[PDB]
Design a protein around this nucleic acid. Sequence first.
RNA 1: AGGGGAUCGAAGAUGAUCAGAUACCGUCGUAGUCUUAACCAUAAACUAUGCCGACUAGGGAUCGGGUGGUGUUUUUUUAAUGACCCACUCGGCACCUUACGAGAAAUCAAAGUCUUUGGGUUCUGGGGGGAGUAUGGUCGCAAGGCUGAAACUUAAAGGAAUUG
RNA 2: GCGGUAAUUCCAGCUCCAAUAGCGUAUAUUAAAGUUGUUGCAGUUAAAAAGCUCGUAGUUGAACUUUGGGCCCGGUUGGCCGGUCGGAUUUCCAACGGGGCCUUUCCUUCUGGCUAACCUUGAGUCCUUGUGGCUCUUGGCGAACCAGGACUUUUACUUUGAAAAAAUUAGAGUGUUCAAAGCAGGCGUAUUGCUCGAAUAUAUUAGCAUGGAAUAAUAGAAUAGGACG
RNA 3: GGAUAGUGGCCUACCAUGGUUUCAACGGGUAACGGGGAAUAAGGGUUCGAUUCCGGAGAGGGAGCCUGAGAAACGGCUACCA
Lengths: 150, 155, 87, 144, 129, 81
Amino acid sequence: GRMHSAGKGISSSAIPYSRNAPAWFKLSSESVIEQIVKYARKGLTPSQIGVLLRDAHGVTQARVITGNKIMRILKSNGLAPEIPEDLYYLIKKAVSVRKHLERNRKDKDAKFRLILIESRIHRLARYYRTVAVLPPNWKYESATASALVN
Amino acid sequence: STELTVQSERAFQKQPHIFNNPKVKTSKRTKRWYKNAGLGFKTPKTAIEGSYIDKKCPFTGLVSIRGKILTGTVVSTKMHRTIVIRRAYLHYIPKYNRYEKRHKNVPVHVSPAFRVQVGDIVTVGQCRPISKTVRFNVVKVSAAAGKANKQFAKF
Amino acid sequence: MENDKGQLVELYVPRKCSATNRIIKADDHASVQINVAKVDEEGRAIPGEYVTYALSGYVRSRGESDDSLNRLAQNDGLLKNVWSYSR
Amino acid sequence: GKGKPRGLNSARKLRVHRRNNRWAENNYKKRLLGTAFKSSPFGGSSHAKGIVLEKLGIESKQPNSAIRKCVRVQLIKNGKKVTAFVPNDGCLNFVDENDEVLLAGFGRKGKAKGDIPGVRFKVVKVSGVSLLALWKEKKEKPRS
Amino acid sequence: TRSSVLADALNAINNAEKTGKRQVLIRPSSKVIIKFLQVMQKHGYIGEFEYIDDHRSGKIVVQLNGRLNKCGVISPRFNVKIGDIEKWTANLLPARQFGYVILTTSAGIMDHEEARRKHVSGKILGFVY
Amino acid sequence: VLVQDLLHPTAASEARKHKLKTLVQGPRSYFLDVKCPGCLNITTVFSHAQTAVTCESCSTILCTPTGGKAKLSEGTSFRRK
RNA sequence: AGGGGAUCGAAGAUGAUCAGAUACCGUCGUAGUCUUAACCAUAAACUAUGCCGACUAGGGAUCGGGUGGUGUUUUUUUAAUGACCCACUCGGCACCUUACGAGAAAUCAAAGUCUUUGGGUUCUGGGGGGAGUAUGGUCGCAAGGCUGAAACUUAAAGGAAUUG
RNA sequence: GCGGUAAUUCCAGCUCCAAUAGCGUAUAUUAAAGUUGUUGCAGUUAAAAAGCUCGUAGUUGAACUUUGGGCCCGGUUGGCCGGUCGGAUUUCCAACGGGGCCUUUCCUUCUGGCUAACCUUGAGUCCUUGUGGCUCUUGGCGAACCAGGACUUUUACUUUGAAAAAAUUAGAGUGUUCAAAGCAGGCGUAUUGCUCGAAUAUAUUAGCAUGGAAUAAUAGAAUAGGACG
RNA sequence: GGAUAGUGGCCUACCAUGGUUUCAACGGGUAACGGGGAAUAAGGGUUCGAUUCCGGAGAGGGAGCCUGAGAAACGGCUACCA
Ligand SMILES: [Zn+2]
């Protein structure tokens, strides 16, 4: 696949057959759920949080030791932010790129890339809006995204 | 659609031959008539409770449901007491042995008993020529509001 | 290939490769018939008695006649190790 | 699967495309535009009569070397002019100018026949009688 | 993107056959795939297949012999109106006397013969001979 | 080749292929209980860091990440699983 | 429309050459060539070969990332590192040999799995010439771009290979 | 493609061929044409991949949710016998279908009408040592659809059926003397009738009706504003 | 409300701003009446139907109308154009 290029690299997570376990793992649900939530107070992303936990701590996958995905925990304790993580970071990027282009319009490369990024933003937002996780009138425009990120 | 004022016409809106005597002190003010379409069509509470008039009402008006009974997706509710619905289908073409997405927009009356919105799948019943284009009458709202409130705010 | 009331009809029921079971036909002058001999007690090897195999020109060409030989004539008991089903 | 949409609901695109590419079929185009009527000395009819203007002697193409006897003809139905060959040996002896002849096609849909340039028609009858019967001896060319 | 997993399976099997192989690793398993392979083995074209279970969509190891000339899929599962099955078997089968057109009906995934006997019909899946 | 065991692959040429090209795919990264003798307590670490992990109490270090695994900070010990 | 204008250098003038030589060769040299702000939108813009997906065959290199080694080499004190070596794995730019298979052939790991004819999808072509012409529409300051006929004519035009 | 002095193509004689009460021609159309390509084309060099990437309408779109076992009921061919005075039905038996079952298993649901079917049994038995067999009312099966009240996520596909003019087509019957046709006709007591017909099939798309539950869509309980009581 | 045998923007009055469209509206072309059908035989198709049956429309072009159960009739009338 790989949309906005013709790159065809394979790179991911080989998820274990072990839907349960980690056998050698102690603690409880309580432990890691508190972890998640307090890190959410600190203000980290479920990607950030999961990476951190899987590193310094000993959590193979948060959903296994706790039958629930991270963002679901966040939303459950009222920690879900305005818009999702991927859409957020897309808009943030498009924002930085756009500032770069405001700084020199001579860079057509940045134009092309800005088009791509924003197209991804629009397609994604269309998906999100379809599944009701975004108000069915939600649209991205630059002049408002500047604020919307910050 | 309708709503408000009820008596908002130059003429007096009244159900024909439904005399309510002044001398006979009633506690309902106005005497209401109604029936049932048939075919399984429950006459909604808002029709017998309500105080609208609509002579083009299937449940309180002077029309009759008979002939075709169709369903469709509401595409237009911009007019008054009448809507347009898109009925989609697929057409078989032999030479290619395949189908093609077609559609027709049917004009259809809608009583002030119902409360329609663009998207509500609806069931209509063919009546007599009501207007220049209208031969159907909304007879049941199968949908709801497409989970509208399910797009609410933050927290 | 019989007919109405039994009776074999139509001549010639061709061979068949042992490794692939794909028919061996006449113009394939690239097929092969390998004859291994039914040896007996101490040294000697009974002539007039064979374990025979067919090998389609296909496989011969593809270069798998050797390997398929090993496989075929070991679980046919005249080889011990050499070839293994896993890899 | 090379271009063509194989889906189960892509009838529309398929027949549309079929029309589109039908237009590259020469006789489809011509049958649909109306050419048979629009152009063409005959009106799309099989035959057409017309009066003889002058008698022509058309030198044949290469590598042949002769003179092809013809006539210039003005078609009655539609006043269009057109030159027509006169078949067989003689027969240009049978016409005379101002005569009222009967023309048919050359069996090539337009397209001049052999070595005769720009002649897409021929003579079949003159003066009311068949040119053939004249060339034999069965019949004789009427009064005037 | 993977458009028809059945199509992939059949292509896989055929491509294994031709090359002179005796097994196939096909991927990833499905219900239609399984029932198809089953109607195949019911007439002894393949040996026995095994559903290996990756904790995702599946894997299948199909042991095959060599009776199989060609199995395949009809891309747009057309609708067969019971008078049309004859037309299809005529279309892509070597002879009257053998081979099987196989289709999905509201009486299950079955071959044109079983469909004919049962007197049921529907969409056309593929074919085997 | 021509005929082989797809259901049963040798541990050798199964341990060569890609993490997704195995028979039934699975990870190739391990957890290890790691310890620096400064304190007395051990902390579980994932072999590929991303995050530069420190010990329980003493703000020391444990590993600085790389293009893959985590380079353990010299004066440390570890145990798989 | 400004700057810039070393160089080479459509135009143009010249010396030659030739029957002629508006050329090829020599000299002079305007515009150009550079850059800024706007245009313009085409190249044999080519791999003359649409994109996503699956499968079908062997070999040695090389780019990038990773892993494995009581390999070499760097010495300081053994390491750490850095370069190199070897095996393996992803994703690359390419070659090699093959050919089960394809082709009209030249050739092609796709141009294969295609009369045993169906993974999904976008685009174009239907004898040659007339002709990318005419007409309309639209785009541009212009040069011109896109969209784009017919009448008539014609038995061939064309591709790959073989011998001469 | 023939003809420029020996023309196997012209003008003719002879001889011969082909079709034959008919044969040529001109125009169109269909087949040939896989040269319009759904079936089924072609696009490196022959006609043809847009300079490039985005991208809306359109076409298309991974996998996974009742699978597996047990029992009954009655059909339709066919086999080996025939029991019989060409065809017949039991059981012996396989084969191939349908219906209903119990396996945690809505079948819309109450409120009675209806009950055909048995867990029933009430006496026993014609009769093969009896679960072979069904007439037979008194505790005990719902769905088979009645009518009334109360509600139901929507589809595509497929089956069977109804509703369906004739002529036309496919096609049965009848010797217009044959035949294209026609729907006649055929038989005796041919002096006071007798009688077979005037079939069947297709008739698709859409609408109605009915069975199916694979394939493929659609809707649902996450700010629980959820499910039944 | 009027008008009709009667439903209806059929017409009038008041009032609103709606109705169709790349699933191709609207417009143009047709040497276009529609159907039962016909020609062509592997199949899928292609082509055609003015014409013995059914439905519609017209009576040189247009309008208007009398009579009547039924006609906007034309082998009826009235007016205009040819
Ligand atoms: Zn420490």
